[PDB]
């Protein structure tokens, strides 16, 4: 997999973000995470801060289908090299979702993060 540059336009929700990608606006849905929205507001504020504070945002498509039926890019999003998808799960602000259409590269990574949050009774796991 490869990271590509993008620019933040707008944080939408814990699990969705609008980016300029290849010099057009596109909406991205985070791979392999389910966020609430309860911890919905907390999940959204965490996502928001992570992307808005980042100096560099990058998009990494997986090896599976790259867009959902709503036209959203399905990707791992990084802020300053740290994966947002992972960060949400590790913080107990998202659960790991089922693999969608072959996009499973970071599934074990995320499951590890989730197990740890759960062991810590953190946020959603409290």
Curated annotation (Swiss-Prot):
Disordered as annotated region, ranges: 106-126
Active site: 29, 37, 72
Superkingdom of the organism of origin: Bacteria
Residues bound to Ca(2+): 15, 34-35
Biased amino acid composition, Basic and acidic residues: 106-122
Localization, UniProt: Secreted
Protein name: Nuclease A
UniProt source species: Staphylococcus aureus
Included range, full protein: 89 to 223 of 231
């Amino acid at each position: 997999l490869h990271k590509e540059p993008a620019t933040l336009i707008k944080a939408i929700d814990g699990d969705t973000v609008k980016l300029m990608y290849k010099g057009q606006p596109m909406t991205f849905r985070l791979l392999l995470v389910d966020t609430p929205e309860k911890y919905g507001p907390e999940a959204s504020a965490f996502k928001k801060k992570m992307v808005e504070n980042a100096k560099k945002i990058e998009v990494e498509f997986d090896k599976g289908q790259r867009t959902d039926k709503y036209g959203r890019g399905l990707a791992y999003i990084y802020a300053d090299g740290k994966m947002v998808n992972e960060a949400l799960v590790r913080q107990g602000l998202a659960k790991v979702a089922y693999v969608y259409k072959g996009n499973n590269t970071h599934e074990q990574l995320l499951r590890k993060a989730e197990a740890q949050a759960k062991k810590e009774k953190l946020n959603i796991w409290s």
